[PDB]
């Protein structure tokens, strides 16, 4: 009992490591694949189930399925399998030796929290644990006490206004739009270009393509016009088979779905509009502080130029008499994990944990009362 482990069950990726380290010791995607063919060879009885980078490597003969969908778990067996894998094969640390820290998106069903707490306390018999929010850990990592969080993850995008020493639970907005919808739209448009991708392996391929050759556009109409003069914007990517794919307008089209949800058919508003509404719902005095500080985190906000576009949109919407500043740290991908580690390292938090005596006594209805 010297340190604690912080695990972030990201909608598309899993981050884990020791409390105190500045970088995670285990970064693998949440994939639980199973064989799709029959199997003929006899010198192999291997691992009916596959997880982790192994699944990514041999994805061509597996039906990859994401255990977590838009922030809510759908298959508990897959999540338990990934937890076991991360705890034993990668970390090689017994659950009893150290406690575990878990994080989840806001406005999630209580059933998920109760089931997760019960499984953690019963199966792995962890000495203690806790449940927190990714946005607050982002604040802790950023070393600030006031601001607005843009936690645009792979599965969920949400904002949580905060003030010195207190939060505003009544001004929390959660949007289902996230990286998965962007990937689906990218596949749909790549179909309109002439390239077809259906199965999950090509889903990973398109995910990599978006990660490598996508960016946001300051002006949509101007970019479209310059695309009409398509002689300096098209770029080529090399597929594993060697085929070359040329991508033009699709580079700056899919990211615009964040600001224009109507493309996918969702009757909602963009991230700028949602943040403006959330800040407006707050008290007048704290609006200045919230404008002066705007923290963003998540893997969906690494597109170059996103900060500039958000600043321009907010200034256009907001009155043109004050200053709006956007802060874009270059390590926002692991901000949640860093915040969790710092929070665990805090001396005052050594008593806020939830122990097993606790659970020995009642169904995990205790996760909520406390530990929140």
């Amino acid at each position: 009992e010297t340190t604690a482990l912080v695990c972030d069950n990201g909608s598309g990726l899993v981050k884990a490591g020791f409390a105190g380290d500045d970088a995670p010791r285990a970064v693998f995607p949440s994939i639980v694949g199973r064989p799709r063919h029959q199997g003929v060879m006899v010198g192999m009885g291997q691992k009916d189930s596959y997880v982790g980078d192994e699944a990514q490597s041999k994805r061509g003969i597996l039906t990859l399925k994401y255990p977590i969908e838009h922030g809510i778990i759908t298959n508990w067996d897959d999540m338990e399998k990934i937890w076991h894998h991360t705890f034993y094969n990668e970390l090689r640390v017994a659950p009893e030796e150290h406690p575990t820290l878990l994080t989840e998106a806001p406005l999630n069903p209580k059933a998920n929290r109760e089931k997760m707490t019960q499984i953690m306390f019963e199966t792995f018999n962890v000495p203690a644990m806790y449940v927190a929010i990714q946005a607050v850990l982002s604040l802790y990592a950023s070393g600030r006490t006031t601001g607005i969080v843009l936690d645009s993850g792979d599965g969920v995008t949400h904002n949580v206004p905060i003030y010195e020493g207190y939060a505003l639970p009544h001004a929390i907005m959660r949007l289902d739009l996230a990286g998965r919808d962007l990937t689906d739209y990218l596949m749909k448009i790549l179909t309109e270009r002439g390239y077809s991708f259906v199965t999950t392996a090509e889903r990973e391929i398109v995910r990599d393509i978006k990660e490598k050759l996508c960016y946001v556009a300051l002006d949509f109409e101007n970019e479209m016009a310059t695309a009409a003069s398509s002689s300096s914007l098209e770029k080529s990517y090399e597929l594993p088979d060697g085929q070359v794919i040329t991508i033009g307008n699709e580079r700056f089209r899919c990211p615009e779905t964040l600001f224009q949800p109507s493309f996918i058919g969702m009757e909602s508003a963009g991230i700028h509009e949602t943040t403006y509404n959330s800040i407006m719902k707050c008290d007048i005095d704290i609006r200045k502080d919230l404008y002066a500080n705007n923290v963003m985190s998540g893997g969906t906000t690494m597109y170059p130029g996103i900060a500039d576009r958000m600043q321009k949109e907010i200034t256009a919407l907001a009155p043109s008499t004050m200053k709006i500043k956007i802060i874009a740290p270059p390590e926002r991908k692991y901000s949640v994990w860093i915040g969790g580690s710092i929070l665990a390292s805090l001396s005052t938090f050594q008593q806020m944990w939830i122990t097993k005596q606790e659970y020995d006594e009642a169904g995990p209805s205790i996760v909520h009362r406390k530990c929140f």
Binding site: E69, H70, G71, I72, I73
Partner: peptide
């Protein structure tokens, strides 16, 4: 989810 969205 149960109602609205899949999950």
């Amino acid at each position: 989810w149960x109602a609205x969205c899949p999950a």
